[PDB]
Amino acid sequence: MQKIALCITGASGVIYGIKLLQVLEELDFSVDLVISRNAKVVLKEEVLKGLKNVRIHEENDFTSPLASGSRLVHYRGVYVVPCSTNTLSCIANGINKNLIHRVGEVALKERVPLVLLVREAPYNEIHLENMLKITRMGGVVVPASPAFYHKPQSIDDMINFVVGKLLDVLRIEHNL
Amino acid sequence: MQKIALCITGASGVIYGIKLLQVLEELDFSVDLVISRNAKVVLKEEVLKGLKNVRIHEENDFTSPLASGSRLVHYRGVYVVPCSTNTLSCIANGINKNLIHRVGEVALKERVPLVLLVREAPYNEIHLENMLKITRMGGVVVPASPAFYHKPQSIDDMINFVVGKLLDVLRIEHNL
Asked: Which structural domain, as residue segments, surrounds residue B150?
């Protein structure tokens, strides 16, 4: 089973990251998870898990294997779901305030697939240019914009849509 | 009561445009509506209205008052909800295949507020640059990315969120 890196930042829509995490486990992926403090509060205002093969890394722990290119090059990809506008900026500018930012920088320099789920509205020029820079650098930017193709009925149907889009980015087969 | 221009293009999420239309009427706005053929099919695969003060214009009718700057300068703003990637491109490049594109060009040259609701995923560089050009030109780009701040329960709660964001762009008071 391959390795996947998943970072969850403090932005509205932390649920997308939870759902993505659950699916990766179900599909038998060894997940290395990074959860920001900002993300912890959000999932509440918006822990005990029976999930398998998940290794958690402290958002402040730069000794983490994920912070080493030599280690990261063996992963199938890196997800930052959801990716706050702040994290988007930090990665686009190479400013590293936490492990998550570092992992983005490592993915970029090691050319490891990097996927971001942005959830903001409206967009200002900075948001657009940061996403453009990520994109031009090989990264993939996915806005949390569910569609109505499949005639969704619940919020759950829209979450799965976005999660399915994220998995398709890395060609991971699924049934959502 | 002021005038509002609303264009609905063929893109997944035509529902956002329907909801926005209903709210504008309820808030007592004289709405000039343009509906693409592409949009008609979509709302089905995804007419008889008891709505008041709505004047409909043919997507191909360039004689429409909306195609005249002298007329458009008196509107509070122009909505293109939802705005397909094609329409986004046409307006950003000044290519006019239909009335809707023309109205975007008129709004831009007459500096009439222009608001677009984009629904696409993932974004490629073209999508980003088109949105950036619209933005730099004074237009406002709103991605159809509902948030979970208000703890939504139904798809309806997410539609209202996005619709509320669109109204806030033009400072129109509402209770959604």
From this structure: 1-176
B113 prior amide bond cis, ω within 30: no
Give the resolution to one decimal, in Å.
2.2
Among B residues 101-120, those touching chain A with beta carbons less than 8 Å apart: 118-120
Number of domains in chain B: 1
Q: Which residues of A are annotated as a binding site for FMN?
A: 10-12, 36, 84-87, 119
- Of chain A, the end-to-end C-alpha distance in Å amounts to 20
For residues B7 and A30, what is the distance between their CA atoms, to the nearest angstrom? 47
Residue whose token pair is 């993915």: A107
Task: Please report, in angstroms and rounded to a whole number, the separation of the first and last CA atoms in chain B.
Answer: 20
CB contact under 8 A, A165 and B122: yes
Tokens found for residue B20 = 């926005």
Burial per residue of B7-25, b for 16 or more beta-carbon CB atoms within 10 angstroms, e otherwise: bbbbbbbbbbbbbbbebbb
Give the CATH number, domain containing residue A68. Answer: 3.40.50.1950
Give, in order, the Cα–Cα distances in Å from A117 to each of A17, A145, A166.
9, 9, 8
Method used to determine the 3D structure: X-ray
